[PDB]
């Protein structure tokens, strides 16, 4: 029913699929480590996407399970739980009142699909590490958005596996449009594009047009894709805006992943990357810095775009900043 | 022998590269690159073992396809030699470092390696594995770079083995920036920016250009190699005509694949409904002349003879087209 199994209670947790702060770790446990499959299936059913795009349910489940299997179980942060989280967070953002009836079903499908594949086959090390170690991936992609190009290629390639083509009943034009949107969205998740992306989002907020009900008026592909890019980027950077217990766990996981990268750097006699040295870390201080320099500036701007829809998310972010500030040794 | 006599023209625009291809046993890229590396003393400067250089060049040349009419090793050798001439333009004297020179020449050599003889748009439209790998974005150019660099890993092929770490990093960045700029979809943006650079250009007393940051330097190198890539119509008519025969052969083969697949045949790819003369005049009027006149402005008067030949060849190609 939920598309995996077994001994439920899962249904009661999934009632929060439309809420910020769904307990995605609980969902992962209750689903036998299939949070991405369970959450995607739930969202596709809720949004009636199977009917709209004539997606056979068995094809959807087969693709989701295959996709989920290509997130690495031994990567602490960039795994299937993170993918599930970003999907579900995008799903909530898409339903914000300021965006009512703004996006087509194909644009919604693109944002959700992009979210699901956006980190697939992540090795648990950064683009810069891949470049510095002369990896085959960095060679393939000429040092540019190395991971993000790879996530796209894998996510699309998996559609070709037996009974995995969830887009089989889209028209040729729809497939082309969705492909372009998905590429545009996932490439925008490269953190090196953050400053430019934000600057442009600020420009959009300055010139925003809304109806009397505060619904955004987007004029063209440029407007629509920019909103979707920033939406998924916000979802990717949403951990510090979540209920504190979720945020605390995400922080533990990213630090575990960073520290493992630092261990690889130390073993190779390389300079250890910022925040990756387990011997000299300031986890709490670094979270406060992350919020002050990256996450708050982004979310404050999103909050402006959709005002006042994101006020509670912003309030939670500010409370969570204080938690980490208060726990600096 | 005769080859040595022909290679005496290596510093001149209009080198007979087809003759060099014949005389060298179809090794124009290897012989021209070797000649240029000796001429510019690059082996000494960068401590490149001659055996390593030849090994790499032969394997690189092997990775251009013999069965592709235009985008083959002869084209690569032509772009290398043309870049070599442009680098020596008086307006640019003593402007570029040896590493920058090495980057531009290397970029030229690898810039179309493993080209399949079909366009990016064809690869995108046919859902090719290459377009899947590269997310429909500069598909060929990303691939040319990956292959060109990958070949440095073959036995005794690392020509950059004695560069410092920082030199290797810098060369890699520049080569990527240059080859990506050969994607024709970037042409109008490159040109718009080149025009603005020309408008605000700075020169020394001796009239050499002042390029005081990476952005300006790489911009000039990008446009230089792009001009070399688009230099066929600026060459002596006998050479230009041969290049035109080759590109049309390649285009028509793509059009044949499109027709077989039931696709709309791309512009200039239908052997049954194409005018070679009309298409060349269009290529010159809308792409090649606007680019070369801007290059000519940048380095005035260095490129006046090149621009003259281009204008002559345009007048020649339009001569048999009836007009009011
Ligand atoms: O495909 C070309 C772009 N179009 C756009 C609009 O004007 C017509 C050309 C550029 N390109 N890209 C790869 C190879 C070449 C290219 C290189 C030498 C060419 O001609 C001659 F010099 F040999 C050449 O000729 C074109 C083909 C028919 C008309 C002129 C093309
Ligand atoms: O993985 C790349 C590559 N980086 C490049 C530079 O050095 C290390 C590797 C970046 N990245 C992707 C996702 C996150 C991230 C998600 C949640 C985070 O915190 C908490 F919300 F969970 C988080 O916190 C970090 C510690 C404070 C600043 C970053 C980071 N980072
Ligand atoms: Mg990512
Ligand atoms: Mg069907
Ligand atoms: Mg607008
Ligand atoms: Mg090319
Ligand atoms: Mg003109
Ligand atoms: Zn992510
Ligand atoms: Zn070329």
XYZ file of C-alpha atoms and ligand atoms in Angstrom:
722
model
C 0.000 0.000 0.000
C 2.844 2.366 0.897
C 4.907 0.521 -1.737
C 7.316 -1.485 0.462
C 6.321 -2.974 3.917
C 5.888 -4.097 6.576
C 4.585 -3.746 10.151
C 3.022 -0.301 9.658
C 2.559 2.690 11.973
C 4.101 4.093 8.806
C 0.681 5.392 7.764
C 0.431 7.620 10.832
C 3.872 9.124 10.181
C 3.094 9.673 6.492
C 0.168 11.854 7.538
C 2.862 14.495 7.976
C 4.026 14.225 4.345
C 2.402 17.618 3.737
C 4.132 19.187 6.740
C 7.531 20.744 7.381
C 9.278 18.465 9.837
C 7.911 15.122 8.775
C 10.113 12.706 10.723
C 11.991 11.284 7.783
C 14.329 9.171 9.921
C 11.334 7.420 11.458
C 9.994 6.842 7.931
C 13.333 5.325 6.921
C 13.197 2.867 9.814
C 9.513 1.962 9.386
C 9.974 1.326 5.662
C 12.972 -0.991 5.898
C 15.302 1.759 4.663
C 13.111 2.709 1.714
C 12.210 6.304 2.604
C 12.745 7.605 -0.953
C 10.482 4.977 -2.518
C 7.787 5.361 0.161
C 7.774 9.154 0.115
C 7.874 9.465 -3.696
C 5.054 6.953 -4.083
C 2.973 8.857 -1.524
C 3.605 12.177 -3.261
C 2.850 10.864 -6.753
C -0.440 9.408 -5.506
C -1.385 12.552 -3.568
C -0.659 14.830 -6.536
C -2.397 12.412 -8.936
C 0.735 12.286 -11.081
C 0.299 8.653 -12.138
C -3.025 9.459 -13.768
C -1.886 12.756 -15.307
C 1.176 11.255 -16.948
C -0.090 7.679 -17.347
C 2.708 6.287 -15.191
C 2.168 2.595 -14.441
C 2.481 2.140 -10.675
C 4.738 -0.903 -11.016
C 7.041 1.109 -13.292
C 7.152 3.920 -10.735
C 8.011 1.521 -7.901
C 10.634 -0.321 -9.953
C 12.331 2.950 -10.916
C 12.198 4.303 -7.359
C 13.704 1.148 -5.892
C 16.476 1.185 -8.500
C 17.130 4.878 -7.881
C 17.152 4.348 -4.128
C 19.664 1.486 -4.524
C 22.072 3.915 -6.212
C 22.265 6.119 -3.159
C 25.160 4.759 -1.074
C 24.124 3.180 2.229
C 27.561 3.788 3.761
C 27.523 7.533 3.116
C 26.353 9.247 6.312
C 24.623 12.294 4.853
C 24.312 12.082 1.066
C 22.175 8.963 1.033
C 18.591 7.941 0.276
C 17.285 9.591 3.456
C 18.646 12.962 2.322
C 17.071 12.436 -1.104
C 13.734 11.573 0.537
C 14.033 14.682 2.703
C 14.697 16.993 -0.233
C 11.795 15.470 -2.201
C 9.401 15.895 0.698
C 10.626 19.416 1.442
C 10.158 20.411 -2.220
C 6.681 18.881 -2.063
C 5.787 21.164 0.867
C 7.322 24.241 -0.769
C 5.375 23.606 -3.993
C 2.140 23.830 -1.976
C 2.939 27.235 -0.454
C -0.057 29.586 -0.863
C 1.984 32.183 -2.783
C 2.509 29.547 -5.513
C -1.066 28.315 -5.892
C -1.807 27.379 -9.525
C 1.501 28.873 -10.649
C 3.148 25.687 -11.901
C 1.970 23.143 -14.441
C 1.820 19.447 -13.577
C 4.916 18.934 -15.770
C 6.831 21.611 -13.831
C 5.750 19.980 -10.560
C 6.871 16.576 -11.871
C 10.226 18.095 -12.890
C 10.867 19.640 -9.445
C 9.983 16.445 -7.622
C 11.939 14.194 -9.980
C 14.924 16.568 -9.830
C 14.788 16.461 -6.029
C 14.739 12.643 -6.051
C 17.782 12.245 -8.298
C 19.696 15.322 -7.238
C 22.438 13.534 -5.229
C 22.243 10.000 -6.644
C 25.493 7.954 -6.519
C 27.107 10.579 -4.303
C 30.479 9.219 -3.127
C 30.529 11.263 0.100
C 33.306 13.600 -1.002
C 33.146 17.108 -2.456
C 33.672 18.382 -5.993
C 36.918 19.970 -4.866
C 38.177 16.668 -3.439
C 37.320 14.952 -6.738
C 39.243 17.631 -8.641
C 42.230 17.575 -6.252
C 42.594 13.809 -6.486
C 42.387 13.710 -10.313
C 39.344 11.480 -10.173
C 37.890 9.934 -13.316
C 34.677 11.879 -12.668
C 36.525 15.208 -12.615
C 38.290 14.122 -15.808
C 34.940 13.281 -17.443
C 33.383 16.602 -16.479
C 36.303 18.995 -16.852
C 36.229 20.038 -13.207
C 32.830 21.736 -13.593
C 29.802 20.780 -11.481
C 31.371 17.336 -11.417
C 28.998 15.676 -8.962
C 25.869 17.421 -10.215
C 26.488 16.419 -13.834
C 26.991 12.870 -12.618
C 23.802 12.817 -10.511
C 21.840 13.888 -13.601
C 23.452 11.321 -15.881
C 22.775 8.479 -13.449
C 19.215 9.548 -12.677
C 18.350 9.683 -16.363
C 20.297 6.522 -17.260
C 18.301 4.496 -14.710
C 15.106 5.217 -16.681
C 16.517 2.790 -19.265
C 16.521 -0.233 -16.954
C 13.827 -2.884 -17.341
C 10.384 -1.470 -16.547
C 11.848 1.792 -15.203
C 10.776 4.363 -17.774
C 8.351 6.453 -15.771
C 8.189 9.023 -18.593
C 7.221 6.510 -21.291
C 3.794 8.109 -21.809
C 4.905 11.726 -21.957
C 4.868 13.266 -25.423
C 8.196 13.937 -27.115
C 7.839 17.656 -26.381
C 6.956 17.001 -22.725
C 9.978 14.725 -22.339
C 12.219 17.396 -23.859
C 10.827 20.113 -21.597
C 11.044 17.988 -18.457
C 14.609 16.965 -19.281
C 15.678 20.603 -19.670
C 13.994 21.651 -16.428
C 15.515 18.784 -14.467
C 19.003 19.565 -15.757
C 18.557 23.259 -14.948
C 17.392 22.436 -11.420
C 20.015 19.849 -10.480
C 22.915 21.896 -11.849
C 21.708 24.755 -9.616
C 22.280 22.578 -6.543
C 26.065 22.916 -7.008
C 27.017 24.912 -3.907
C 29.546 26.918 -5.906
C 26.582 28.540 -7.687
C 24.920 29.601 -4.445
C 26.079 33.226 -4.354
C 25.016 33.890 -7.934
C 21.720 32.077 -7.483
C 20.900 34.079 -4.349
C 21.887 37.397 -5.915
C 19.469 36.688 -8.739
C 16.737 35.597 -6.322
C 17.129 38.933 -4.528
C 16.693 40.685 -7.875
C 13.509 38.703 -8.455
C 12.157 39.629 -5.031
C 12.849 43.312 -5.690
C 10.716 43.196 -8.829
C 8.159 40.613 -7.750
C 4.623 40.790 -9.122
C 1.694 39.378 -7.233
C -2.073 39.304 -7.420
C -4.104 40.861 -4.616
C -4.119 37.480 -2.865
C -0.314 37.524 -2.867
C 0.056 34.828 -5.519
C 3.194 35.163 -7.638
C 2.883 36.142 -11.276
C 5.602 34.409 -13.291
C 5.853 35.437 -16.935
C 8.008 32.943 -18.764
C 10.402 30.009 -18.528
C 13.142 32.164 -17.012
C 10.877 33.193 -14.118
C 9.483 29.708 -13.559
C 12.811 27.884 -13.694
C 14.459 30.436 -11.417
C 11.790 29.875 -8.789
C 12.093 26.098 -9.121
C 15.901 26.217 -8.935
C 15.785 28.283 -5.780
C 13.018 26.154 -4.319
C 15.001 22.945 -4.657
C 18.160 24.706 -3.450
C 16.223 25.857 -0.369
C 14.993 22.275 0.135
C 18.601 21.034 -0.142
C 19.613 23.652 2.479
C 16.582 23.131 4.718
C 18.072 21.093 7.591
C 18.629 24.046 9.948
C 15.013 25.158 9.411
C 13.582 21.833 10.587
C 12.419 20.804 14.091
C 15.568 20.736 16.198
C 15.767 16.977 16.696
C 15.894 16.452 12.927
C 18.474 19.233 12.524
C 20.663 17.770 15.275
C 20.712 14.418 13.480
C 21.461 15.968 10.089
C 24.363 17.832 11.663
C 25.782 14.638 13.164
C 25.548 12.969 9.743
C 27.170 15.718 7.692
C 30.005 15.955 10.187
C 30.547 12.196 9.983
C 30.715 12.466 6.213
C 33.018 15.509 6.267
C 35.337 13.860 8.797
C 35.655 10.779 6.601
C 36.690 13.004 3.712
C 39.234 14.708 5.950
C 40.600 11.306 6.917
C 41.155 10.574 3.220
C 42.885 13.917 2.763
C 45.101 13.402 5.820
C 46.080 9.929 4.620
C 47.202 11.374 1.282
C 49.155 14.222 2.868
C 46.703 16.763 1.455
C 45.537 19.953 3.142
C 42.427 18.984 5.068
C 39.331 20.772 3.781
C 37.465 23.289 5.946
C 35.330 21.549 8.585
C 36.697 18.118 7.666
C 39.317 17.703 10.409
C 37.873 15.605 13.245
C 40.921 16.534 15.333
C 40.205 20.249 15.131
C 36.504 20.791 14.702
C 34.062 23.285 16.134
C 30.793 21.661 15.120
C 28.492 24.081 16.944
C 30.357 27.220 15.875
C 30.381 25.961 12.287
C 26.602 25.483 12.281
C 26.140 29.047 13.527
C 28.411 30.242 10.705
C 26.542 28.094 8.152
C 23.273 29.716 9.227
C 24.632 33.264 9.367
C 26.451 33.160 6.032
C 24.475 30.731 3.857
C 21.182 29.402 5.194
C 19.608 32.502 6.746
C 20.456 34.828 3.833
C 18.835 32.293 1.483
C 15.744 31.572 3.556
C 15.153 35.232 4.438
C 15.026 35.912 0.686
C 12.712 32.979 0.001
C 10.535 34.183 2.876
C 10.342 37.593 1.172
C 9.297 36.019 -2.128
C 6.415 34.081 -0.568
C 5.632 36.409 2.355
C 4.259 35.498 4.825
C 4.128 31.770 3.984
C 7.576 30.907 5.335
C 7.470 32.937 8.539
C 7.417 29.877 10.816
C 10.286 28.241 8.923
C 12.327 31.396 9.430
C 11.405 31.555 13.129
C 12.532 27.957 13.590
C 15.808 28.676 11.816
C 16.458 31.528 14.249
C 15.651 29.370 17.298
C 17.924 26.621 15.986
C 20.773 29.075 15.469
C 20.461 29.915 19.157
C 20.598 26.223 20.099
C 23.978 25.766 18.452
C 25.210 29.126 19.738
C 24.236 28.033 23.268
C 26.142 24.761 22.931
C 29.485 26.155 21.807
C 32.006 24.958 24.402
C 62.714 15.841 -48.311
C 59.726 17.522 -49.963
C 58.059 17.494 -46.538
C 60.883 19.575 -45.057
C 60.427 22.116 -47.846
C 56.680 22.369 -47.221
C 57.229 22.748 -43.466
C 59.297 25.860 -44.160
C 55.893 27.542 -44.478
C 54.833 26.603 -40.933
C 54.906 30.240 -39.792
C 52.734 31.405 -42.688
C 48.976 31.680 -43.123
C 47.930 29.287 -45.875
C 50.337 26.423 -45.244
C 49.384 23.579 -47.578
C 48.201 21.234 -44.860
C 46.742 18.695 -47.298
C 50.156 18.281 -48.941
C 51.722 17.848 -45.504
C 49.109 15.173 -44.736
C 49.989 13.243 -47.909
C 53.766 13.586 -47.510
C 53.748 12.590 -43.836
C 51.792 9.393 -44.414
C 48.654 10.917 -42.907
C 50.407 12.308 -39.844
C 49.902 16.059 -40.314
C 49.001 16.623 -36.676
C 52.099 14.843 -35.365
C 54.509 16.526 -37.776
C 53.023 20.006 -37.433
C 52.844 19.842 -33.629
C 56.409 18.530 -33.476
C 57.640 21.292 -35.797
C 55.860 23.977 -33.805
C 57.128 22.663 -30.460
C 60.703 22.769 -31.803
C 60.175 26.196 -33.386
C 58.867 27.666 -30.142
C 61.490 25.799 -28.082
C 58.701 24.259 -25.997
C 60.476 20.934 -25.385
C 63.371 22.712 -23.696
C 61.220 25.206 -21.806
C 58.943 22.563 -20.304
C 61.397 19.664 -20.212
C 59.285 17.564 -22.565
C 61.057 14.371 -23.695
C 60.858 14.196 -27.492
C 59.890 10.518 -27.388
C 57.027 11.294 -24.998
C 55.833 14.130 -27.237
C 55.815 11.944 -30.341
C 54.154 9.062 -28.486
C 51.358 11.330 -27.254
C 50.885 13.041 -30.628
C 50.626 9.761 -32.510
C 48.031 8.397 -30.089
C 46.101 11.696 -30.160
C 46.186 11.653 -33.949
C 45.009 8.038 -33.876
C 41.949 9.217 -31.959
C 40.781 11.461 -34.763
C 38.580 9.395 -37.091
C 39.837 8.661 -40.597
C 36.288 8.116 -41.880
C 35.064 11.564 -40.835
C 35.441 13.915 -43.801
C 36.034 17.227 -42.045
C 36.508 16.734 -38.302
C 39.675 14.688 -38.544
C 43.406 14.986 -37.907
C 43.919 17.303 -40.872
C 41.444 19.784 -39.380
C 43.180 19.503 -36.019
C 46.575 20.119 -37.627
C 45.131 23.128 -39.481
C 43.712 24.670 -36.306
C 47.020 24.084 -34.474
C 49.016 25.755 -37.243
C 46.555 28.644 -37.569
C 46.668 29.255 -33.825
C 50.462 29.154 -34.045
C 50.365 31.956 -36.623
C 47.847 34.041 -34.652
C 49.919 33.756 -31.478
C 52.735 35.559 -33.269
C 50.640 38.536 -34.363
C 52.588 41.786 -33.733
C 49.768 43.230 -31.560
C 50.269 40.395 -29.087
C 54.077 40.391 -28.961
C 55.430 39.390 -25.542
C 51.890 39.403 -24.136
C 51.462 35.703 -23.380
C 53.577 33.498 -21.143
C 55.112 30.292 -22.453
C 52.544 28.347 -20.414
C 49.691 30.282 -22.063
C 51.197 29.602 -25.495
C 51.492 25.903 -24.646
C 47.861 25.870 -23.481
C 46.528 27.476 -26.683
C 48.473 25.119 -28.952
C 47.577 22.014 -26.910
C 43.920 23.102 -26.814
C 44.001 23.459 -30.588
C 45.457 19.998 -31.011
C 42.849 18.213 -28.912
C 39.878 20.451 -29.626
C 37.931 18.018 -31.869
C 39.433 14.644 -30.848
C 37.146 11.602 -31.296
C 34.610 13.713 -33.186
C 31.899 11.395 -34.590
C 31.066 13.617 -37.564
C 27.670 14.710 -36.294
C 26.575 17.847 -34.442
C 25.708 18.426 -30.812
C 22.073 18.913 -31.827
C 22.030 15.556 -33.638
C 23.519 13.874 -30.572
C 20.891 15.547 -28.383
C 17.985 14.779 -30.731
C 18.942 11.108 -31.090
C 19.233 10.587 -27.325
C 22.880 9.583 -27.698
C 24.970 8.236 -24.835
C 27.253 11.255 -25.177
C 24.374 13.674 -24.720
C 23.163 11.616 -21.738
C 26.630 11.794 -20.152
C 26.902 15.539 -20.668
C 23.348 16.709 -20.016
C 22.948 18.167 -23.506
C 25.504 20.907 -22.725
C 28.588 21.393 -24.946
C 28.381 17.641 -25.468
C 31.157 17.261 -28.029
C 33.454 19.850 -26.532
C 33.330 18.323 -23.065
C 34.088 14.955 -24.666
C 37.017 16.283 -26.740
C 38.568 17.630 -23.537
C 38.022 14.431 -21.551
C 39.585 12.299 -24.299
C 42.478 14.700 -24.933
C 43.425 14.722 -21.251
C 42.735 10.988 -20.766
C 45.281 10.142 -23.462
C 48.009 11.748 -21.335
C 47.608 8.648 -19.122
C 48.793 6.201 -21.784
C 52.316 4.785 -21.515
C 54.992 7.460 -22.046
C 52.332 9.968 -23.084
C 52.483 12.500 -20.246
C 54.000 15.464 -22.033
C 53.358 17.631 -18.975
C 55.223 15.344 -16.582
C 57.828 17.996 -15.740
C 55.502 20.934 -15.182
C 55.057 22.085 -11.584
C 51.773 21.267 -9.868
C 50.642 24.888 -10.227
C 51.610 24.966 -13.909
C 49.633 21.790 -14.608
C 46.589 23.177 -12.784
C 46.797 26.464 -14.662
C 47.279 24.786 -18.049
C 44.356 22.452 -17.397
C 42.026 25.339 -16.553
C 43.067 27.338 -19.608
C 42.726 24.388 -21.997
C 39.235 23.646 -20.687
C 38.231 27.311 -20.996
C 39.528 27.390 -24.582
C 38.025 24.152 -25.911
C 34.620 24.888 -24.359
C 34.632 28.214 -26.222
C 34.780 26.305 -29.547
C 31.137 25.241 -29.077
C 29.299 27.170 -31.804
C 26.301 27.740 -29.561
C 28.539 30.137 -27.610
C 29.625 32.083 -30.679
C 27.268 35.046 -30.387
C 28.066 35.581 -26.716
C 31.804 35.280 -27.336
C 31.513 37.781 -30.181
C 29.359 40.269 -28.251
C 31.951 40.257 -25.477
C 34.897 40.464 -27.882
C 33.352 43.553 -29.460
C 33.137 45.198 -26.033
C 36.751 44.256 -25.292
C 37.798 45.903 -28.555
C 35.849 49.050 -27.643
C 37.753 49.465 -24.374
C 41.127 47.964 -25.356
C 44.407 49.243 -23.874
C 47.744 49.293 -25.720
C 51.363 50.073 -24.853
C 53.474 52.665 -26.669
C 54.708 49.970 -29.065
C 51.058 49.235 -29.779
C 50.892 45.866 -28.040
C 47.698 44.948 -26.202
C 47.558 45.215 -22.414
C 45.803 42.232 -20.824
C 46.186 42.617 -17.062
C 43.960 39.853 -15.664
C 42.999 36.230 -16.346
C 39.570 37.134 -17.709
C 41.005 39.378 -20.429
C 43.861 37.001 -21.240
C 41.706 33.896 -21.525
C 39.112 35.847 -23.515
C 41.729 36.649 -26.147
C 42.942 33.037 -26.251
C 39.357 31.725 -26.546
C 38.582 34.022 -29.437
C 41.946 33.305 -31.048
C 41.338 29.561 -31.174
C 37.716 30.150 -32.238
C 39.013 32.272 -35.140
C 41.474 29.505 -36.030
C 38.631 26.967 -35.929
C 36.641 29.265 -38.262
C 39.587 30.153 -40.500
C 38.860 28.048 -43.610
C 37.203 30.865 -45.619
C 40.214 33.123 -44.892
C 42.640 30.733 -46.606
C 43.777 30.634 -50.252
C 40.793 29.665 -52.388
C 42.249 26.293 -53.389
C 42.455 25.258 -49.712
C 39.105 26.789 -48.780
C 37.369 24.914 -51.597
C 38.755 21.608 -50.279
C 37.571 22.361 -46.734
C 34.123 23.168 -48.100
C 33.950 19.859 -49.980
C 34.809 18.046 -46.767
C 32.312 19.776 -44.490
C 29.506 19.260 -47.008
C 30.367 15.568 -47.268
C 30.178 15.311 -43.492
C 26.929 17.270 -43.276
C 25.286 15.221 -46.010
C 26.181 12.010 -44.183
C 24.468 13.365 -41.075
C 21.461 14.326 -43.186
C 21.355 10.788 -44.564
C 21.191 9.452 -41.011
C 18.433 11.929 -40.189
C 16.438 10.934 -43.282
C 16.798 7.227 -42.450
C 15.510 7.925 -38.920
C 12.555 9.886 -40.264
C 13.871 13.087 -38.695
C 13.658 16.550 -40.185
C 16.917 17.026 -42.061
C 19.117 19.704 -40.487
C 19.883 22.883 -42.468
C 22.564 22.247 -45.113
C 22.498 18.498 -44.534
C 20.165 17.516 -47.403
C 22.300 16.451 -50.375
C 19.229 16.764 -52.612
C 18.280 20.328 -51.645
C 21.362 22.328 -50.702
C 23.282 25.177 -52.310
C 26.954 25.035 -51.429
C 27.582 28.567 -52.686
C 24.579 30.061 -50.902
C 25.555 28.289 -47.703
C 29.168 29.511 -47.817
C 28.132 33.100 -48.494
C 25.732 32.824 -45.557
C 28.456 31.292 -43.329
C 30.786 34.164 -44.189
C 28.189 36.926 -43.895
C 26.616 35.819 -40.631
C 29.445 34.072 -38.751
C 32.943 34.193 -40.189
C 33.229 37.800 -41.358
C 31.618 39.294 -38.245
C 34.114 37.359 -36.135
C 37.187 38.097 -38.250
C 36.407 41.789 -38.662
C 36.299 42.015 -34.865
C 39.578 40.131 -34.471
C 41.005 42.433 -37.139
C 39.897 45.468 -35.103
C 41.557 44.070 -31.997
C 44.913 43.569 -33.690
C 44.711 46.263 -36.393
C 46.351 46.221 -38.900
C 47.846 42.745 -38.348
C 44.988 40.789 -39.861
C 44.213 42.994 -42.841
C 45.589 40.482 -45.370
C 43.501 37.706 -43.808
C 40.367 39.858 -43.898
C 41.139 40.797 -47.520
C 41.293 37.126 -48.531
C 38.052 36.441 -46.699
C 36.307 39.289 -48.483
C 37.737 38.113 -51.810
C 36.538 34.548 -51.210
C 33.059 35.845 -50.279
C 32.862 37.793 -53.513
C 34.029 34.687 -55.332
C 31.391 32.369 -53.818
C 28.561 34.841 -54.471
C 29.668 35.346 -58.073
C 27.693 32.437 -59.563
C 24.519 33.065 -57.568
C 21.989 35.047 -59.636
C 20.987 38.309 -57.983
C 18.916 41.384 -58.743
O 28.068 24.509 -38.831
C 28.558 25.850 -39.012
C 27.442 26.803 -38.494
N 26.410 27.232 -39.487
C 25.508 28.265 -38.913
C 24.856 29.295 -39.871
O 25.616 29.624 -41.040
C 25.968 28.402 -41.689
C 26.942 27.596 -40.816
C 29.916 26.023 -38.274
N 30.701 24.782 -38.205
N 30.523 24.084 -37.058
C 31.299 23.026 -37.195
C 32.005 23.017 -38.400
C 31.627 24.180 -39.051
C 32.056 24.587 -40.389
C 33.395 24.675 -40.820
C 33.706 25.068 -42.132
C 32.671 25.358 -43.016
O 32.736 25.754 -44.337
C 33.980 25.840 -44.996
F 34.706 26.816 -44.410
F 34.645 24.677 -44.928
C 31.356 25.261 -42.585
O 30.481 25.582 -43.559
C 29.147 25.825 -43.223
C 28.411 24.583 -43.700
C 27.408 25.009 -44.750
C 27.334 26.524 -44.656
C 28.589 27.010 -43.978
C 31.046 24.877 -41.288
O 29.363 18.334 0.528
C 29.684 19.634 -0.019
C 31.233 19.879 0.013
N 31.929 20.575 1.142
C 32.853 21.581 0.561
C 33.774 22.313 1.558
O 34.354 21.530 2.615
C 33.711 20.291 2.954
C 32.813 19.646 1.886
C 28.906 20.818 0.635
N 27.665 20.468 1.309
C 26.639 19.807 0.771
C 25.664 19.681 1.741
C 26.183 20.350 2.867
C 25.632 20.526 4.212
C 24.372 20.110 4.656
C 23.988 20.312 5.995
C 24.860 20.929 6.896
O 24.642 21.183 8.229
C 23.485 20.703 8.879
F 22.413 21.372 8.395
F 23.304 19.378 8.689
C 26.118 21.329 6.449
O 26.915 21.923 7.373
C 28.281 22.004 7.038
C 28.959 22.468 8.305
C 28.616 23.955 8.283
C 28.905 24.376 6.853
C 28.678 23.106 6.051
C 26.487 21.122 5.130
N 27.424 20.814 2.578
Mg 24.393 17.775 -4.154
Mg 2.846 4.041 -23.971
Mg 8.474 38.264 -14.507
Mg 34.502 21.351 -32.482
Mg 29.291 42.279 -42.476
Zn 21.626 17.421 -1.612
Zn 37.146 22.337 -34.999
